[PDB]
């Protein structure tokens, strides 16, 4: 199953404790949230509690080499948990199939569906049941009162890959507290603008998120989480002008601002 174009939510994944295995190869489990991925894949299969370590790369076994093989550069996570009452009734479950024989080893991320007759010896058996050839697919027997290592376990493997496509899956969107009437920087999904956010008196139609002016400048953006209209204004800029009494007359000067609004006198021509 391929999962993409959605906000990743691993919070409920580690805030649950019903699972038995939370080993994340390649990438550390402590920082999934601040990582953006392109494609997310999730496999699912049921295996006995004995053959759970064989899912890890490097190990070898019947399941690890004939049914499911993982690459040595795996950068994902493996989730396993125990479900005995759901997967087995009082009589046991016999609809689950697995492989014990194959012509050779299996490459990673490769599955096989063919159910031919496995050949072990040199003399062919002409495609019928007999000696030196058997049926490589085998049914499995479950018990309700069996051992803890022989109860059914559900294993789900998560795979994360990076391609040239833009990231379609990122960690939960972070929404900081809104601060107004201060020279701050905001990024409302379309622009990295720096300025104040005053309270406007103009209503916006209920389909718009942006807004421009006569001079074609984005100066009005709607906040999405509370539906208020906030204006964008540059903080302040100007020049430092000085007045001088002259030479051989004085030594002190005064700082004059062109249009910056604030001994100190508030003149019409600035500060």
């Amino acid at each position: 199953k391929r999962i993409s174009n959605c906000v990743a939510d691993y919070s409920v994944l580690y805030n649950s404790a019903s699972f038995s295995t939370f080993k994340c190869y390649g990438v550390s489990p402590t920082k999934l949230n601040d990582l953006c991925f392109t494609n997310v894949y999730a496999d699912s299969f049921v295996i006995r509690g004995d053959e759970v370590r064989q899912i890890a790369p490097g190990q070898t076994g019947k399941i690890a080499d004939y049914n499911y093989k993982l690459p040595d550069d795996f950068t994902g996570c493996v989730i396993a948990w125990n479900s005995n009452n759901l997967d087995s009734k009082v009589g046991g479950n016999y609809n689950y199939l697995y492989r014990l024989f194959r012509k050779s080893n299996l490459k990673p991320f490769e599955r096989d569906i063919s159910t031919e007759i496995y050949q072990a010896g040199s003399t062919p058996c002409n495609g019928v049941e007999g000696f030196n050839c058997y049926f490589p697919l085998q049914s499995y027997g479950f018990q309700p009162t069996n051992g803890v290592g022989y109860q059914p376990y559900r294993v789900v493997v998560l795979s994360f890959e990076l391609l040239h496509a833009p990231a379609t899956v990122c960690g939960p969107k972070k929404s900081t507290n809104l601060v107004k009437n201060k020279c701050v920087n905001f990024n409302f999904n379309g622009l990295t603008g720096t300025g104040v956010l005053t309270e406007s008196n103009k209503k916006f139609l209920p389909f718009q998120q942006f807004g421009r002016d006569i001079a074609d400048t984005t100066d009005a953006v709607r906040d999405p989480q509370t539906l208020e209209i906030l204006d964008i204004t540059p903080c302040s800029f100007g020049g430092v002008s000085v007045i001088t009494p002259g030479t051989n007359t004085s030594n002190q000067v005064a700082v004059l601002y062109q249009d910056v609004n604030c001994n100190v006198f508030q003149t019409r021509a600035g500060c």
């Epitope: 580690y14 805030n15 404790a17 019903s18 038995s20 295995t21 489990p29 402590t30 370590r53 890890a56």
Partner: antibody, heavy 120, light 110 residues
Framework: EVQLVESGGGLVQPGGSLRLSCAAS????????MSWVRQAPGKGLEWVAN????????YYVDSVKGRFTISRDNAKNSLYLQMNSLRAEDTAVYYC?????????????WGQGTLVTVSS | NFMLTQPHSVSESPGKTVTISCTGS????????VQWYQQRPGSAPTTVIY?????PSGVPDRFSGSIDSSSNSASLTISGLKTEDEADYYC?????????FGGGTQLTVL
């Protein structure tokens, strides 16, 4: 800087009822795992309890099963631990443990603790 | 019946690399994460190992750890062996909805 105080001990009782409290500050109490852990004087470490960040799921060791209870709230940022039917083995120093993501990351958070001894 | 086996007095050496081994019995310790905890004698405990490969901020890089699967054991290696190392170590794992702690390995004479 995460700040922890524990003050629930200081008295002896055989088989009675006792209350220990751990108060935490400097973080969000409603998002991370919490646990309770004790050690005997002169002995090694052992695990006591854990609780989910909303208090929905709680678990114990089989030695204290049947007794013991734990509860939490997010309004005043404190952990509640209540005990009953104490024994002589309960002479231990209790630390309130704080988790990060789950029971696999590790404890990583150890309070100063309160000396708790029992007598008959 | 998951339990972790480790010594009680090791690393009694000055100024060279030594290793401490903690091994599991009931199950494979490589399935889940194992951690090492360093506690001050008579004071609050701390942690030297989390995630089985990384370090807390401020902890020196002298310590190092490794995992082998042939023995089902956890190896923690100490390089500097400075005057700060006076503590006892524990190894903690997780089998199923429960936590298990190690016996403890006292290290005093460095």
């Amino acid at each position: 800087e995460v700040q922890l105080v524990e003050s629930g001990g200081g008295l002896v009782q055989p088989g009675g009822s006792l209350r220990l409290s751990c108060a935490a500050s400097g973080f969000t109490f409603s998002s991370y795992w919490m646990s309770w852990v004790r050690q005997a004087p002169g002995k090694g470490l052992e695990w006591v309890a854990n609780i989910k960040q909303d208090g929905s799921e709680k678990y114990y060791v089989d030695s204290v099963k049947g007794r013991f209870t734990i509860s939490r709230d997010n309004a005043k940022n404190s952990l509640y631990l209540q005990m009953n039917s104490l024994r002589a083995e309960d002479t231990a120093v209790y630390y309130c443990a704080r988790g990060q993501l789950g029971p696999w990351v590790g404890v990583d958070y150890w309070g100063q603790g309160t000396l708790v001894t029992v007598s008959s | 019946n998951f339990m972790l086996t480790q010594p009680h007095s090791v690393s009694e050496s000055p100024g060279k690399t030594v290793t401490i081994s903690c091994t599991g019995s009931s199950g494979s310790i490589a399935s889940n994460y194992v951690q090492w905890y360093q506690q001050r004698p008579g004071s609050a405990p701390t942690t030297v190992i989390y995630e089985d490969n990384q370090r807390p901020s401020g902890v020196p890089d002298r310590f190092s750890g490794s995992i082998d699967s042939s023995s089902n054991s956890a190896s923690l290696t100490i390089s500097g062996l400075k005057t700060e190392d006076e503590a006892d170590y524990y190894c903690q794992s997780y089998d199923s909805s429960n936590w298990v702690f190690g016996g403890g390995t006292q290290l005093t004479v460095l």
